[PDB]
Amino acid sequence: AVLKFTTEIHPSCVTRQKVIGAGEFGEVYKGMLKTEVPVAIKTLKAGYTEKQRVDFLGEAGIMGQFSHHNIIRLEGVISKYKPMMIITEYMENGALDKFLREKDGEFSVLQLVGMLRGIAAGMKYLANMNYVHRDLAARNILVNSNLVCKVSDFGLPIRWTAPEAISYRKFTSASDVWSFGIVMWEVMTYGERPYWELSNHEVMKAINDGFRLPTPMDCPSAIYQLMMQCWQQERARRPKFADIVSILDKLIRAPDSLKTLADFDPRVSIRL
Numbered sequence: 001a002v003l004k005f006t007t008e009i010h011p012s013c014v015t016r017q018k019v020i021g022a023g024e025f026g027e028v029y030k031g032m033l034k035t036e037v038p039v040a041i042k043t044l045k046a047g048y049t050e051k052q053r054v055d056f057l058g059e060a061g062i063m064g065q066f067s068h069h070n071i072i073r074l075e076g077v078i079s080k081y082k083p084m085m086i087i088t089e090y091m092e093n094g095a096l097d098k099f100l101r102e103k104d105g106e107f108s109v110l111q112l113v114g115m116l117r118g119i120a121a122g123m124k125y126l127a128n129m130n131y132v133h134r135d136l137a138a139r140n141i142l143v144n145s146n147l148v149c150k151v152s153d154f155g156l157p158i159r160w161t162a163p164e165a166i167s168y169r170k171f172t173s174a175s176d177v178w179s180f181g182i183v184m185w186e187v188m189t190y191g192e193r194p195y196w197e198l199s200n201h202e203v204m205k206a207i208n209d210g211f212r213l214p215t216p217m218d219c220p221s222a223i224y225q226l227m228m229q230c231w232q233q234e235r236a237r238r239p240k241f242a243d244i245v246s247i248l249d250k251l252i253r254a255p256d257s258l259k260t261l262a263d264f265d266p267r268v269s270i271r272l
């Protein structure tokens with residue numbers, strides 16, 4: 001029943017090709033699926049514990065339940081044979097943080113805001129399904145060849161985490177909203193490191209002292225206003241994901257709304 005939303009894939013349809021990561025007790029590979037389609041494949045290798053099996057098949061089962069344009073698509077699961085596997089779609093463009101950093105300045109404001117609308121729609125879906133992500137960050141978002149962003153989770157983030165989650169482990173959709181605000185800043189800066197060189201303790205002290213990240217360059221005023229309200233100390237005052245999706249949708253559909261830019265604070269004076 002755990003796998004009720006998932007298709008069981010036969011091992012003969014899967015070809016693992018290269019290791020692209022390490023799972024909790026296994027490797028992640030790039031490979032091919034016949035039914036050929038490129039896929040990502042996470043294995044659970046011999047010797048896994050009971051807890052690891054529960055977490056692995058539980059992950060597969062929740063992923064099978066998710067069917068949304070902005071959530072990574074599960075192709076299927078191998079549970080009847082060993083090694084067990086979770087198989088997803090593969091995105092040639094890869095993870096959003098590296099993608100942005102390698103394409104600095106190459107997109108329009110409308111394209112960047114469109115990416116954020118898609119991420120927000122995915123998060124609205126997860127929150128509605130009562131799934132708390134806990135690690136929302138550009139590094140966990142994949143980009144397809146239509147620039148569509150798919151929320152994912154590759155495993156292990158002070159800089160992205162809401163204060164109540166840091167302080168007492170209160171992870172909710174509202175702490176995900178804080179993270180989403182950080183993702184907004186990541187997108188609009190083309191993948192800059194949140195808080196630059198500040199250490200983790202310096203970031204937490206700054207947040208507690210009331211400081212917040214400054215505006216990206218060339219950032220629409222409405223977009224910075226929105227990310228700032230994602231960073232309200234009081235969890236109950238932050239927008240819900242429904243509010244975020246609605247605002248982003250309305251801004252894109254009336255795109256002149258994005259022409260008004262927030263003032264950028266220069267960190268350097270050049271006089272000529």
Ligand SMILES: Cc1ccc(NC(=O)c2cccc(C(F)(F)F)c2)cc1Nc1nc(-c2cccnc2)nc2c1cnn2C
Nearest residue numbers: 021028040041042071072086088090091094151152153154
């Ligand atoms: C195979 C697999 C198994 C499990 C998961 N699980 C989730 O994403 C997950 C879990 C819980 C909740 C949610 C959410 F709530 F967000 F929906 C999502 C993803 C993939 N797939 C990957 N794919 C790629 C990849 C790389 C380059 C281009 N394309 C793809 N790298 C990966 C992984 C996994 N690791 N790595 C390094």
